[PDB]
Each structure stands twice: as structure tokens, then as C-alpha cells.
């Protein structure tokens, strides 16, 4: 297809057998080699076999391909010799995003996230790659964290901001944390948060659905308990960062996301009873 | 101090000022204490400084910090030079990251996780890093590489860390990619931590040599080798796991191992006296 710049693909015949059997393109095989990262041929096979080729193609390959597309399109803007000044910097960021995506890959392959999440997660980087075009136009923007972020990204950090910024903690301490950790860690946080919020909201709907009173309110206890704990972690981590206690934003996102998921299922299961 | 004149910020809390006056701390010294204070409260740094005595405070806290701030001031002059408008911002941002890291050492010190020797040892790691701006402005492309920000000492340390990490399986390019992903802020901190462990291990080495050859020398010797092993293994593991997509932080658990070596040194010395 369009993604000619790749030229790195599966060589393992067993995987090749499941990819041909699944009926995906040369384009397809390439994309899988990309997100394969340094995970073995065999383990990529092991995950994929358990799932239907049907589910696989739309949930995994399609989304990956959308990304590789927009990355090809961004790569061009680096290659352009008008952008030689900003070239190396852009390539570096490209490598960071690459690692992050391959990580979402890793996470899906070893079973930590489902197909749905994988699809949802990988698309997060599409606007980030697309952002290169805009940045080149007036380069001074790169020395800021926000210079690298689309409006969905800014929206998400502005949400986290409203969670942490308060009387005692202002826009300045917050922005300072983000400038310290860098885009790499910032976007990772963004994604992790998005996950947590999505699953929290599904648990919300599911709980509303439960017949009024009896155990319904007991569920909303857990919902509120979990939300409080998570929001607390966000504040705790940012305060701790500004205070000098630690040098890393850690929200315990994955743990809380799983908590909301279990909760959603108990709410769906209690609607029925 | 004319070198600290760019600062414009110093202790306000009057009881703290009284204690610093009781100690002989200059104006500049006040300005330094205010600097490493960060967001800690005057009560906290008062509590710490009080139990220590003017001799130690002046020599291990104030003198090193003040030297550091003089350096940071030079670096600031390079930043604000109008020639360097084009890169001004990017340097200030690094300047801020470095502030944070220093205030962190401040923090560990005030809350008792490190003592005076470590504070003075660790805080001067940053002087080269600020000085480096002077060179960086002359050839701005260097900023696009993490090694562009490292001074000679930093380079040395990284090379050494590389030798611990690089394999037939894991090569110089992979190693360099994690450095670049993580950025200078995390890279320099891993360097300080590593240096602490390395320095403590050597102290523990000497202390074991001092033990009369014999009964418990071996048992201590085992610990030294085992500990070095465990640490070096943590380093390799964290880099591999990083390029493998397993995790997104370089973490060597270095503080834990610094303490292990310090305890080991103390045990070694108590053993010299007993035997």
C-alpha cells in the first residue's frame, strides 16, 4: 500500500502461515512486524492464534495501519530539506513515539490489555504524528510541552489540571512538572488516564442501570471510593513531584482501570438479578 | 557576593534567620539555604540545621551550594546574552530541570535520607552541567543529543555504565536509544545515583581490606561481591526491559544498594576493631 518506507516484515513461516490464513496483505505482515517489536515470532503467533482472524484484522491490523500511514506522512515532513534545522529533533521524537506504540503492542501480546483497548490506544498517537506538519511552520513551539500536542491531548491534560491545580497548587507548579518529565512521560500519562476515565464512565452507566436501591447504592460506594483514590493518586504524585520527594508521575492507572472494569461487570450482572 | 546578586530570594522566616546568624551564615549563604529549601517549610530545614552545628553546615551545606549558585549565575549570563535569543528558552528549561534535581538532593538531605557528606558530594555534580552551556551555545545542534549536555565527567560515567550493559545481544545503539527516550533529566539522575553506589562500594572495599585476613573477612567479602552482582544485574535488566517494551523507566534500585554498601562498610570497620 502507501507504507513503502517500512520494508521490514515477518520471516517466520509459522506466523506467515497464520497471516496468510488470516488473509492480510504484504501491508499487513509489515505492520505486524512493526508492533512485534522485540517480542519473539512465536509469542506473536501464540496470542493471535487464540483469537479469530476476523476480530484480529479490524481490531489490530487496521488501526496499526492507520498509524503507520500518518507516520509515513510525517516522516516526509522530516525528510524535507526545508526542515533540516528541526530534522534531528523530529526524528528523536519519532523514536520515542515508536517505543511507546511498541509498548502498547507488548502489553496486548502478553495479555495485559484486550483487543478493544489496543485499537483505542494505538490511535492516540495518530494526532501526535500528524502534529509534525504544524510544528515545522513556526519551530519555536517545540521548547514547550504543549507545542507537541493536538487539542485532544491538551483537553486531556487540562482535565488532569483541574484535578490537581487548586488553592495551594497553581498552574505554574503543574506546568513545571510536565516540562520536567518531557513529552515521552506526559503522553504516556495521558493515555493511561484516558483508559481509566473510559472504564470509569462505563461503570457509571452500568450502575445507573441497576434497579434503584437495594445493592445499587452499595456499588456506587465502590465507584466513588475508587474515583477518590485515583484522583488522590494524581494529586499525591504531582505534589510529591513539586516537593522533591520523587521524580516520576505515577498514578497507578492500570490498577484502577481494572478496578472500574470489574465494577462495570458486577453492575451489569446485578442489573440482571 | 556579587556572584549571587542575580538571586533576589532568601530566607524570610525570622527564627531561621536567627539561627543562621548564630552560625555566621553570610547573605549569600542565606540565599543558598533558601534555594535548596525548595517547597519544604522553614520548620523542616530549621529542625535539620539545628541538630548539626555551624562548622558542618557552613562547610558541607552552604559552601558547596554557594559555589553551585555562582556557576548557575555564569550560566545565566550565557542564557541572557542577546546572541543566544534563538536558544534562550531551551536552556532555561534545562536550567529548571536541573533546579528540580538539586532541590531533590536538598529534600533527601533535609528529611534525613542522606547526610552532609552525600549532600556536598552530590550537589557539585551539577556545576559542570551548568558550565556546559557556555560551550553549548557555540554549537546548538549538540542539544539534539543527550551526550551534547553531558560534561567529561558525565561522559566517563555513561561510558562505564554502558560497559556494564552492552553485550553481544544488547549493543551501543540500543543503549543509546533508551537514553534518548528518557531524556537528559532522567539520564543525569541515573548518573548521580550510580556514582553514589560506586563510591560507597569502594569504601566498603577498603574497609574489608583493613579487616585482618581470616575468620569473617570472607563472609563480608561474599556480601561485597554479591551486592555488586545484584546491582549490575539490576542495570542490565532495566535497560533490556526498556528496549523490550516491558517498562518505561530506567530504574537500578541504586539508593537501596548505596545503603547496603554503607552498612557493609560499618560492619567491616566494627569487625577490624573486634579482631
Numbering used by the authors:
A (entry chain B): 163 to 435
B (entry chain A): 162 to 436
Which passages does the manuscript contain on this structure?
One of the proteins identified in these studies was classified as BTA121. While BTA121 does not share appreciable sequence similarity to any known protein domains or motifs, its N-terminal region is enriched in proline, glycine, and glutamic acid and contains a potential procyclic acidic repetitive protein (PARP) domain that was previously reported as having roles in Trypanosoma brucei survival and successful replication in its insect vector, the tsetse fly. BTA121 is a completely helical protein separated into an N-terminal and a C-terminal helical bundle. BTA121 does not share structural similarity with known proteins, and has the characteristic palmitate-binding cavity observed in tablysin-15, and palmitate binding was confirmed in vitro.
Recombinant BTA121 was produced and the crystal structure of BTA121 was solved using Se-SAD phasing. The final refined structure was obtained by phase extension by molecular replacement into the 2.8 Å resolution data collected at 1.000 Å wavelength. A total of 548 amino acid residues and 13 sulfate ions have ordered electron density  forming  a dimer. The first 91 amino acids of BTA121 and N-terminal putative PARP domain are disordered for each monomer. The monomer can also be viewed as having four helical domains (D1, 164–214; D2, 215–299; D3, 300–344; and D4, 345–435). Domains D1 and D2 are in the N-terminal bundle while D3 and D4 are in the C-terminal bundle. There are two possible crystallographic dimers; dimer 1 has an interface of parallel helices; while dimer 2 interfaces through loops. The interactions at the dimer 1 interface are hydrophobic and have a palindromic sequence. BTA121 has a network of interconnected tunnels connecting the large cavities some of which contain sulfate ions from the crystallization solution. The channels and tunnels connect all the cavities containing sulfate ions. The presence of such an extensive network of tunnels and cavities suggests that BTA121 may bind small molecular weight ligands, including lipids.
